[PDB]
Amino acid sequence: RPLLIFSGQSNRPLAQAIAEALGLPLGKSTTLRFANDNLFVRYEESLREGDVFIVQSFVPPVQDHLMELLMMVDAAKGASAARVTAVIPYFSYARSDKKDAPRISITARLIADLLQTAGADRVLTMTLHSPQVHGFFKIPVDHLSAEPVIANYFATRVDLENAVVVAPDAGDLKRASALARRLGLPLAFIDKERVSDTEVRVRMLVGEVEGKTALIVDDEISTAGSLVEAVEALMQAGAKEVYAAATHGVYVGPALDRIAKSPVKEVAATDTCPPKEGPKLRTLTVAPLFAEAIWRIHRGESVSSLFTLEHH
Amino acid sequence: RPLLIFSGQSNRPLAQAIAEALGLPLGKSTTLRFANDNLFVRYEESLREGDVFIVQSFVPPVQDHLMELLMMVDAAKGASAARVTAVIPYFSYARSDKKDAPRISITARLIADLLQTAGADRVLTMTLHSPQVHGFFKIPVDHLSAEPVIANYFATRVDLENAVVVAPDAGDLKRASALARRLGLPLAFIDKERVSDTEVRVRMLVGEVEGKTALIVDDEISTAGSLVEAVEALMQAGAKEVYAAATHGVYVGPALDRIAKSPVKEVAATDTCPPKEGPKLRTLTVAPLFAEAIWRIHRGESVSSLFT
Amino acid sequence: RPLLIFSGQSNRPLAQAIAEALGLPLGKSTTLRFANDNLFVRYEESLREGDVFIVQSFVPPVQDHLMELLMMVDAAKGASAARVTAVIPYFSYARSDKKDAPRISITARLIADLLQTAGADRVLTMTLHSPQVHGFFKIPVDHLSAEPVIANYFATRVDLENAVVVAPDAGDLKRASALARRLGLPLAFIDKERVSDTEVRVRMLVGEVEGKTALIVDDEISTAGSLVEAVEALMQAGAKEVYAAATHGVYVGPALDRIAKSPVKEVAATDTCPPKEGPKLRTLTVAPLFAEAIWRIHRGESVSSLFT
Amino acid sequence: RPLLIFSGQSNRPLAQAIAEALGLPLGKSTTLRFANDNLFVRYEESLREGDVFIVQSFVPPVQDHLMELLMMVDAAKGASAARVTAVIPYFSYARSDKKDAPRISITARLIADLLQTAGADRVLTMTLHSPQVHGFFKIPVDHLSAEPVIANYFATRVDLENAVVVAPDAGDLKRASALARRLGLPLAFIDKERVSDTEVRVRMLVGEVEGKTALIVDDEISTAGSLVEAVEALMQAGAKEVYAAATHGVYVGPALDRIAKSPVKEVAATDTCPPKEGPKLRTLTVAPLFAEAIWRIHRGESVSSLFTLEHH
Amino acid sequence: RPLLIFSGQSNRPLAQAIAEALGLPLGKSTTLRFANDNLFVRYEESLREGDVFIVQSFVPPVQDHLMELLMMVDAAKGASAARVTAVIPYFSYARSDKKDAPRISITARLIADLLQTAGADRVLTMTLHSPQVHGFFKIPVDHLSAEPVIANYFATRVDLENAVVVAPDAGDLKRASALARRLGLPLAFIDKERVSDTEVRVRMLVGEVEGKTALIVDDEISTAGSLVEAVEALMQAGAKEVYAAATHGVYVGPALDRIAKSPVKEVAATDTCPPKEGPKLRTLTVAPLFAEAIWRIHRGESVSSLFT
Amino acid sequence: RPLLIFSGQSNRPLAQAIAEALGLPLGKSTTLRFANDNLFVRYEESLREGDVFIVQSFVPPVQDHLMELLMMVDAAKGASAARVTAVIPYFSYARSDKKDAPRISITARLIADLLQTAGADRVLTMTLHSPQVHGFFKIPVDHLSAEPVIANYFATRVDLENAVVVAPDAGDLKRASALARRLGLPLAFIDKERVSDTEVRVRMLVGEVEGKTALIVDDEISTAGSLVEAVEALMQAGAKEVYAAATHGVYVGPALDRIAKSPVKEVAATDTCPPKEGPKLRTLTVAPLFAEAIWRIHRGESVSSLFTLEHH
Ligand SMILES: Nc1ncnc2c1ncn2[C@@H]1O[C@H](COP(=O)(O)OP(=O)(O)O)[C@@H](O)[C@H]1O
Numbered sequence A, D, F: 001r002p003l004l005i006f007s008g009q010s011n012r013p014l015a016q017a018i019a020e021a022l023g024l025p026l027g028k029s030t031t032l033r034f035a036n037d038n039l040f041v042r043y044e045e046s047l048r049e050g051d052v053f054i055v056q057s058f059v060p061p062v063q064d065h066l067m068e069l070l071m072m073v074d075a076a077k078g079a080s081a082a083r084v085t086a087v088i089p090y091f092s093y094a095r096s097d098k099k100d101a102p103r104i105s106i107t108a109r110l111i112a113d114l115l116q117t118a119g120a121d122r123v124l125t126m127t128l129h130s131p132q133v134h135g136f137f138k139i140p141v142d143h144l145s146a147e148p149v150i151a152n153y154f155a156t157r158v159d160l161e162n163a164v165v166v167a168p169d170a171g172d173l174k175r176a177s178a179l180a181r182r183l184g185l186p187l188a189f190i191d192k193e194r195v196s197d198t199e200v201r202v203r204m205l206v207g208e209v210e211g212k213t214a215l216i217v218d219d220e221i222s223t224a225g226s227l228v229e230a231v232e233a234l235m236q237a238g239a240k241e242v243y244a245a246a247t248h249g250v251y252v253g254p255a256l257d258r259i260a261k262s263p264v265k266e267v268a269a270t271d272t273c274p275p276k277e278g279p280k281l282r283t284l285t286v287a288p289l290f291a292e293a294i295w296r297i298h299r300g301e302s303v304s305s306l307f308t309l310e311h312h
Numbered sequence B, C, E: 001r002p003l004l005i006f007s008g009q010s011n012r013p014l015a016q017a018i019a020e021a022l023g024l025p026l027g028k029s030t031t032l033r034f035a036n037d038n039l040f041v042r043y044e045e046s047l048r049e050g051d052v053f054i055v056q057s058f059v060p061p062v063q064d065h066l067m068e069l070l071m072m073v074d075a076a077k078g079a080s081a082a083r084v085t086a087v088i089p090y091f092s093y094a095r096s097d098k099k100d101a102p103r104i105s106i107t108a109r110l111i112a113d114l115l116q117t118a119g120a121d122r123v124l125t126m127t128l129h130s131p132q133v134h135g136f137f138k139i140p141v142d143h144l145s146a147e148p149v150i151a152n153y154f155a156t157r158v159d160l161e162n163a164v165v166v167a168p169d170a171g172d173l174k175r176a177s178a179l180a181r182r183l184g185l186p187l188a189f190i191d192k193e194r195v196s197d198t199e200v201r202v203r204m205l206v207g208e209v210e211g212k213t214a215l216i217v218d219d220e221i222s223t224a225g226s227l228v229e230a231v232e233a234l235m236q237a238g239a240k241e242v243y244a245a246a247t248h249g250v251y252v253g254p255a256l257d258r259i260a261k262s263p264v265k266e267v268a269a270t271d272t273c274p275p276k277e278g279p280k281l282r283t284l285t286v287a288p289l290f291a292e293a294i295w296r297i298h299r300g301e302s303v304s305s306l307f308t
């Protein structure tokens, strides 16, 4: 069973870097859009009895990328692949994980079912918005952590002697605590409120940030709305400075303008989504980690062992 | 089980015309795009134990409309609809009906499976690109015919005395021969072959078109490449004039410019796709026909005594 | 389709209270254990073309109750029920909602699939451990909220003037903030982390509790380890007093001894699980609320105008 | 995973020729019919973890052959085969591919679903009546073409200097055009009408047939009704002579009598269906092509490469 | 949902007798064979939102009848039936119920799955070869008993005073003992073993048959090999006379000649299979019993207060 | 694909003996019960792309053992096992194989469906209560026979010169006849009735038992109700003595007391269920036969060949 890697249109540079890290070419496939906006996929060479891995992130245009992935998985099974894995570095619809209003779609579950119907045997992903999304799949899911790559970034960039990890929202405490333990840093919480959409009010601080290098971490940065509020709150609480990181650098709508305007020193994210150009933006490549996971899925070696427990 | 009608963003005017024909309101549902281009759907009122009909055509943006339909079907079942029908007036991906090259998707079949997985109990549709696409569905499909509205259009709009109906494709003749039979006309057909998405090559023309008014009938008009080449080939062959009709007026890319430029006298299509205004374009509404079919599906009355 | 209600052995008192609220008898069904500890279920009368509701909570013995529910669902479909709803007032395995260690079962999802395979057409439940568990089901779930009965309990039973609602867990805030909002109170939360099945470590306390009457609201109380540690941590932080409420009063192992010993003034829970008598324990019945939801599911009326 | 080949009762000679071309014995299986007309299948030896290929064509008695195939696929999965392929050289029910009347079965789709339920992992077939029938299967389908074998036959039999390929029906133009391009021949069309079921009227001819060796090709010959009409029309249009070929030589009811009575010089068909004895009947064996396809399915080599683009 | 009854080609007389007992017409459907022995089915009128019952027994030609049933079920669902019941008065392949040799089909289970895939929502059947075959179906099965019509036949047709009921097979005793109990008679049984499709070897005879009138009751009579060997073995053992009854009078190959030749006095069977005339053969119609069961399934009334 | 064997809590000694007979360690897995009586399973090491076999018998507590098995099968698929086999040495619910009352569960079929839903690819079992239970599974089932091990036991224990096999119930004749043919013994039948639950009446005897060593065999001994009645009937018919054997020594409720009180010389059963201590109880280990079957399933060798036709 040859190992074969293909890409949709979402993140061909990540797919290419993954193939190169495996010492393999990126498989040849074409995606066309007809004048009627219908899609067409075709594998240019045989992938018969292949262990096929198809890379696609849920970035704009999202529904074209979802359909391209469904059609490439379908076409791979139809062309007699032995096994088909959906490599989905950023699964945006993991945010659609609950029925928080009546009569909506739990779209993360619907998409799991659609991927299974299309013929996916497995999923490989990173930093799901919520860990319960794993249970929306019947097929095996290998869920990679960005914890080691994000902690490495900070360890190489900031003054650890004078640093603190800050959660700006109750939901951020678990991921922030993991980072704090990895860097040997104190953990603080900043309870803030957007009052007049130009001012944010510091209600409560637990821990110390005054004159400290504050670190914030999230699963994703979309519009940078939460990043901006936390940084403003932290400078109002007298932080020296703020470094931010996330797994998914989605960077849509006002994100780039907001980051340029914010006093935030730097914003780092992986390449699960194609990076955008910006003076304070940094990229943390996960091509080598996805390549190692794919190698281990293919050979039946331990993907769980890739979650290291190193302390800086 | 109350009759409930809802619309996606593809063709709200047709859905509204269907609701009005049934004497019902169009049900309230929200579709929005988050900043990250992710879709969100919500039914504003209960549809619990409803006989739910969701109207969506496959028109640009097609993948957004496909996903909005899948999400509306899913959310209707999740909101305890008694039955959910995907009313798909135009199913574009019916053209993806065969494996004409290795290692492609038969995307019509894939989408049938996605619609079933999303929770569709049935489909209502009109003029599938090929009749075999009916077999891509496990759930029941009511497959409506445009033949009555197209027959009526030619019967009253064109001189019939020296007319021939032309099938623009040799593989798909049943439609042209049934229309030819219905208007008491002879039949010609074009043997083409597609060169690109936008260009076709006429390899042969069978039948008598010399000095005749030629009536092209097709399933759809997309780029209008097949239409204007068939008109070029009929005029070159000595046709007096050409008229055309299709169910699906998709009219993308160079279509409206190509039709306006072509010597074709008039082009009729239904409103399965939102009509685009043009001097030589005519709309044949199928709202009443979709309404009558929905009423009949709802009540358990014969749909065949209309359709196909 | 007649409305039919049945009970497993887990919570016959709640099922009986639901039946009485609907003005119906509790349907007759036998469950027995053979000498070899194999289960046997039998419906004593026809439920053919019935709208069948089977009440079972996940309380000890939990695997016997799970299997009795699966077997009652299966036998109801095999006896030609028109529709079968698994009414699961307490779904314990909602706590098994994530893969927080390698090579485990996401048991909430497994059980959703087993319930579907057994033949369940729907689920009715209350206060799932996490809202994402709704997405583990393909069949529709009506997910009832305890917020009205818990709000009413605190509003009338405790002094509100100097009160704060405390979320005993930082990841699950929507419940505490909606209760805080509803009572016009401020909000504190505990950032914990579980050390064992019976012990939790409070890593941080956010909000103002000094000299306040603290209202703990949680989904469930199992061993009461999280409850008494949160009370220890609030009193240590200078709270005047603590009251607590949860939907699911599971009260296993050292719970009743731990609550009686704790300075907590009172602990309210619903009857999703059969109440256990204790001087500081109060029962908030949800029988009327399950009855109203079943009537509405049966008739196709809005459940959301109660729930969630 | 050993390669194992078995046969139902429909076309044991083709199954035997396929096995022999692979250098393999035909696997031992018995099919009994009890006095009550119920069927019984049994594999005489282990096929555990085998790559098992079961040959059955849809020839009379068709429903016994369909049920035998379903039961052999079922029994193979039940006996712990690794993989089961339905080798269906002639899939008669591909003609039942549309709802052309209300309240009928689209029997080609129903049979696809029944084969999948029985436990088929894959299908290997040749010349489906319509190409849309491929999309009635969820399991992979390898669809072989008879184009190269039929074009070879004509290239070895007829005067190519004076030959023309004729389509006698609009539906026949695509297959006829492919043959014409392969043999470097002109393509003609003959519009004819059966008027008084003893006479057929030539309405229109496009291209030339007068004094030419006319070639006609179809997917199948059942009753030879369409073959007879085309040949009569072509001799009325002054053709020298007519050679006919098809993939599936089904040859039911009056076919043999009609062919003997027709001026048609010769009628060639493959052995997807067991050939019938007749003076003007010729057989074009596809045992070697099915054997090559099976070899390539088994080894994960390119079945698509078997579709050659050779011109005579 | 209107009650609609249809027949395959296997047993149109029984279907007609069922329709007449319900006061309904037998619905119109065409089955034809194409020249190439491919089947074709068509419903002549709408059965949309129908409660559809399709009658087919597994009698020669059995594979044609199986396929005609699968195709009628499929086409009924494709024509938007509300519910489709496969009424299978005789399910021959219930005899293929075990893996008694390696690498065979358990064909009863395969056919249950094919019937489900074709779209059957339920089965109505009578006297399955083994009761376990009920477990081969996921969809509900109403399994009718012949015991009332067989009991009544022996009670009025034979002298009971010196009678014994004989089970012709030691593994299948529940039928003979329930009939023995119902007629107030003692019970004997034959321990056989099948040598071929047409021959059985009696290895042991248990019970008192000397000078008695022996009543053989079996599920079916196929070749009559087991019947005439059991009669040979009872007369050899000193029985005065033998009578026999079975549900399914299949009567293939040498059966009618073997019965006529055997000293057996009379052989009764139902019309699950079209009766074959013979001097010693009697028909016990089960049309009224199938009609009553269909009416009850249709209306949601108790079938068990008849069946099994 | 490594061969990997794990155990639930039901019969760890049998699982351990099977692993040892394969020359393999018993895989490490933990099962916890939380205070709320909920179960938790975890595989301590990778079983990725493993051929995994999970041993569990349906012994008390039965529903905890059923759920543990479902959860271990689920978790194995979730941890990316290549193949998962449910090794179920005693399938108690095979007794729940018919609808003998209205509105009950055919629980053997329900459990088959639950095992398939959990992700079982295959079942390996021994002495099903009824052979029709095989057809309740869609997944392959290897059904082992205890016939050779039970016949060996008697051949090593009893005076074959003066022995007879007795069926005490019509349903017992087939299994008793097989034993009789294997030991070259006559077969007798004893028709008895429990009249006053302290007395049993011999209605009929066919064959001879007077002064003979009577052998009785069953699929299982639960409460020993049927064993006791047969032995009492046989001593009333003047048997010298009675030896009993079964596959499944379930031994619940009064079984041990009843066997001690009965004149039965000895009662032998396999270790499909953990043996209970008793003076007249003997164990016939099937660990070596299950190990051989697992070896052959894993390697694709003939499991059917393990059914020997030896005569003593
Ligand atoms: N959904 C689609 N939209 C537009 N073009 C398509 C679509 N699916 C396939 N096609 C293109 O159209 C070609 C088929 O054109 P044609 O020869 O008319 O066959 P068909 O009978 O399916 O229309 C395909 O080979 C492909 O290039």
Ligand SMILES: Nc1ncnc2c1ncn2[C@@H]1O[C@H](COP(=O)(O)OP(=O)(O)O)[C@@H](O)[C@H]1O
Pocket (backbone or CB within 6 Å): C092, C093, C094, C095, C096, C097, C098, C100, C129, C130, C193, C194, F034, F036, F038, F039
């Ligand atoms: N069904 C269950 N019953 C009790 N404890 C469980 C159950 N499932 C998992 N657990 C345990 O509880 C832990 C989760 O506790 P917690 O941190 O509160 O997460 P959650 O949000 O799921 O409660 C798991 O890691 C496991 O040790």
Ligand SMILES: Nc1ncnc2c1ncn2[C@@H]1O[C@H](COP(=O)(O)OP(=O)(O)O)[C@@H](O)[C@H]1O
Pocket (backbone or CB within 6 Å): D034, D036, D038, D039, E092, E093, E094, E095, E096, E097, E098, E100, E129, E130, E193, E194
């Ligand atoms: N559908 C069937 N029709 C006729 N005979 C069958 C059928 N299926 C299996 N058999 C044959 O009958 C034998 C079973 O006969 P028997 O010992 O009576 O067992 P059963 O209890 O299934 O009748 C099988 O071994 C096979 O030879």
Ligand SMILES: Nc1ncnc2c1ncn2[C@@H]1O[C@H](COP(=O)(O)OP(=O)(O)O)[C@H](O)[C@H]1O
Pocket (backbone or CB within 6 Å): A092, A093, A094, A095, A096, A097, A098, A100, A171, B034, B035, B036, B038, B039
């Ligand atoms: N796929 C999605 N992309 C973007 N926003 C989404 C998506 N799904 C839901 N949302 C919106 O984002 C919010 C979700 O936040 P909530 O579930 O309360 O906490 P969290 O931010 O942790 O997910 C709004 O409730 C919801 O409408």
Ligand SMILES: Nc1ncnc2c1ncn2[C@@H]1O[C@H](COP(=O)(O)OP(=O)(O)O)[C@H](O)[C@H]1O
Pocket (backbone or CB within 6 Å): D092, D093, D094, D095, D096, D097, D098, D100, D171, E034, E035, E036, E038, E039
């Ligand atoms: N499996 C079959 N075998 C034989 N004839 C069939 C079969 N299925 C359908 N037919 C008949 O053959 C005809 C099909 O022709 P039609 O679909 O119009 O064009 P084509 O001949 O290209 O299939 C009749 O419509 C149909 O009744």
Ligand SMILES: Nc1ncnc2c1ncn2[C@@H]1O[C@H](COP(=O)(O)OP(=O)(O)O)[C@H](O)[C@H]1O
Pocket (backbone or CB within 6 Å): C034, C035, C036, C038, C039, F092, F093, F094, F095, F096, F097, F098, F100, F171
């Ligand atoms: N899983 C089970 N464990 C124990 N007893 C059971 C089980 N399932 C059914 N029973 C009981 O055991 C009896 C079954 O006997 P029956 O089916 O008549 O013959 P057999 O004893 O051969 O199975 C009672 O009918 C039934 O209630």
